[PDB]
Amino acid sequence: QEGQRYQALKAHAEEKLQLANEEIAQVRSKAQAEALALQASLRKEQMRIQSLEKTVEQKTKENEELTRICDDLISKMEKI
Amino acid sequence: TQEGQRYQALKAHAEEKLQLANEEIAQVRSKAQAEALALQASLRKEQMRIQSLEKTVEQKTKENEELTRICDDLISKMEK
């Protein structure tokens, strides 16, 4: 019959489709996972960036303050 | 035959469904890898700027170290 051909093929077509849907789920999942991982690593790096920038601002402040204090000391020693 | 028309329409439905599934898979992998490599580019950028900032931090740490040192010297001379 044509019934025969069509069914015998129907089994296999069905298998291929279910396989395809499993892989759809796989790839959706994996994609979200990578998105999360990468966004996290990223904003953590940005966090270290702003941290280091502030450590720099503060190092700078520390050296104008050191200069202020020792130059004040020196100025006062000169008026003795 | 018309039974052939029916089986043609049926099979067309099965393989169009399959086509759409594989298209979904393709789309997801495409989008995912695209965004992934953009984000990894960004990560790269940030890690190298981090390295630079670390350099500046060490540099200023040393400078302040020196200023502090010689100030402490002047002081210690003026103590006794």
Curated annotation (Swiss-Prot), chain B:
Instruction: Give the induction note.
Output: Up-regulated in various cancer cell lines.
Its subcellular locations are: Cytoplasm; Cytoplasm, Cytoskeleton, Microtubule organizing center, Centrosome; Cytoplasm, Cytoskeleton, Spindle; Cytoplasm, Cytoskeleton, Spindle pole
**Assembly notes:** Interacts with microtubules. Interacts with CKAP5 independently of clathrin. Interacts with CCDC100/CEP120. The coiled coil C-terminal region interacts with AH receptor nuclear translocator protein (ARNT) and ARNT2. Interacts with GCN5L2 and PCAF.
The family assignment reads: Belongs to the TACC family.
Q: What is this protein's function?
A: Plays a role in the microtubule-dependent coupling of the nucleus and the centrosome. Involved in the processes that regulate centrosome-mediated interkinetic nuclear migration (INM) of neural progenitors. Acts as a component of the TACC3/ch-TOG/clathrin complex proposed to contribute to stabilization of kinetochore fibers of the mitotic spindle by acting as inter-microtubule bridge. The TACC3/ch-TOG/clathrin complex is required for the maintenance of kinetochore fiber tension. May be involved in the control of cell growth and differentiation. May contribute to cancer.
The entry's protein name is Transforming acidic coiled-coil-containing protein 3
- Source organism per entry reads Homo sapiens
This protein's gene is called: TACC3
Q: Which residues of the full protein are shown?
A: 758 to 837 of 838
